[model samples]
Target: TPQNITDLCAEYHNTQIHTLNDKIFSYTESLAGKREMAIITFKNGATFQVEVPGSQHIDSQKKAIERMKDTLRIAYLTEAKVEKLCVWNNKTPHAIAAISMAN
Candidate 1:
């Protein structure tokens, strides 16, 4: 019975991760070739790519990205950490964030 529970938990985690990744990918793709970008990272070291965004103010881009972080926060069951802001000079501007997923 314990073994079965472990397997179930692992399966559930995998499924949840896949669903979250798909959601991120779709959201980013929707904004592809646009002005904004996003990047979603997992506690397990998995990082998903979004597109890029910013303006001369840079602060404007920061606010927009803060909102994106909020959107991601509500999308999942666990909490996420905003690690850092995006680099504008990079080919694909994006920020880094991660979530905690455990039983």
Candidate 2:
């Protein structure tokens, strides 16, 4: 299941000690209205905007959120320290979540 903003925020809180600077997750429609896209903003101001694709008839937005969760989990596990994450493609599953050091 795709995670909501609250769930993603909770996940971040659970993984790190530094508080989030800001976070956002929203969707938009294309001019044709046939394509949907998701925009994700993480704690460090990194943003990911990508086209949403369906998975087994699942909700596209939900799937996108799930991808965000996966990326976050992986980043936490790897202990990455960066300001931006790469999720330009359907790369969330393989993307690394950013967790910059606070100073």
Candidate 3:
């Protein structure tokens, strides 16, 4: 029954639940820090950054970094491969570095 419910839920996604207007997300500073902040917006749109540590370029570990990138892109968190998963800010160019999902 649960599986049937799940399948039905998936089908519902293809149908429009509502005729929606353009969605916007605005960030207002709440908690502030050099590397972190709290933001308030029209909707619940807080995002987290996964920071990889900075390092000077060296020879031995370069291949390891390449493999890490390969894993991030290829790992399937659920049934779908990440290649099928897509996201967009759909609005503005953002100044971001080392976004784990930003490729």
Candidate 4:
């Protein structure tokens, strides 16, 4: 469910303080300006933006956010921090990753 996933992510962000070595990291979602996206900001003021896929279906949107999390993990080593956060992709049992957002 897109609503469930959104709430879960928001809660995770609120309860956890993610850090890479000495830098604390925080994230936020914005649908303004250039479409849906997540902004990862670090204590040092360095920021990274990842575009969100546009989808009306819950399963599709779930998979898209999971993919975003993966990219964030690879870039910032945010492995264990968010591993407990889970969402179901009703369309498939296994996870899939892709670069493009176009449907």
Specify the highest-lDDT model's number. 4
User: What is candidate 1's lDDT per residue for 17-48, written digit by digit as tens?
Assistant: 13232222222323446644545554554455
Ranking by TM-score: 4, 1, 2, 3
lDDT for position 6 in model 2: 33
* Worst 10 contiguous positions by lDDT, candidate 3: 79-88
Q: Model 4 TM-score?
A: 0.32
lDDT of 1: 0.39
Question: Model 4 clash pairs?
Answer: none
lDDT of 4 by residue, 1-103 (tens): 3344334444432232222333226656575865566655556664444545544346656775767766655544532232222323332221222222111
- Model 1, position 73, has a per-residue lDDT of 46
Which TM-score value belongs to model 2? 0.26
In candidate 2, position 27 carries an lDDT of: 27
For each candidate in the order shown, give its overall lDDT on alpha carbons.
Answer: 0.39, 0.40, 0.27, 0.43
Task: Report the C-alpha lDDT of model 2 over 8-31, residue by residue, as the tens digit.
Answer: 334532222223443233323244
Order the candidates by lDDT, highest first: 4, 2, 1, 3
Question: lDDT, candidate 4, residue 81?
Answer: 31
lDDT string, candidate 3, 76-98, tens digits: 22212111111123312211122
TM-score of each prediction: 0.28, 0.26, 0.23, 0.32
Better of 3 and 4 by lDDT: 4
Worst 10 residues of 2 by lDDT: 94-103
Q: Pull out the clashing pairs in model 2.
A: none
Per model, state how many residue pairs clash. Answer: 0, 0, 0, 0
